[PDB]
Amino acid sequence: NSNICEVCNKWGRLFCCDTCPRSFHEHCHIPSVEANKNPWSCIFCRIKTIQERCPESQSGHQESEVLMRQMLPEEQLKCEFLLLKVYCDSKSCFFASEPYYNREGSQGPQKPMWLNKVKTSLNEQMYTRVEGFVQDMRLIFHNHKEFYREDKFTRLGIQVQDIFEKNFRNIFAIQETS
Ligand SMILES: [Zn+2]
Ligand SMILES: [Zn+2]
Ligand SMILES: [Zn+2]
Question: Which residue range is the domain that position 10 belongs to?
């Protein structure tokens, strides 16, 4: 197994996957690493198993169909993995915790949003459809663009949104387009 956390790239108290060489901090894995379960398989292994069981699940889909799916166990898992993929980028630190807004010439957003809040919402099964999760994720970056306006700090929102969007298209097998 790896000697660093797959998500945050630091050593510490790590839990090791039994089916691949990844390791995790307890609250870096999503969902949080399970108390018992020997063997234990991480979210990367669980996602690979879904595709292996149903190879046709990788054929191209329309985004509009994906968004309307109900959050059954497999879609819940895919959203947890997509959230994890955003936490795996170090620039996710800017969007993890509750923001505040006091900048000359800007007003804060109507509905603030952040990664930890989305993490809690997923854990408490508050989203009924994939659309709920995706809308909150996109809102994080949209609020950031709007608030920071012409400051070059707006680019962090662009960069982290690109990681989200790429991973969304991969995990949910969105039909490739020009
Ligand atoms: Zn970690
Ligand atoms: Zn694994
Ligand atoms: Zn199948």
Answer: 1-59
Distance 173 CA to ligand 2 centre (A): 21
Method underlying the structure: X-ray
Cβ–Cβ under 8 Å, residues 87 and 32: no
Ligand closest to Cα of 17 equals 2
Cis amide linkage into residue 112, ω under 30° from 0: no
Instruction: Give the closest ligand to the alpha carbon of residue 29.
Output: 1
Using the mean position of ligand 2's atoms as its centre, give its distance from the Cα of residue 144 in Å: 33
CA of 40 to the centre of ligand 2 (A): 8
Give the experimental resolution in Å.
Answer: 1.9
One domain, residues 20 and 64: no
| Largest pairwise CA distance in the chain | 55
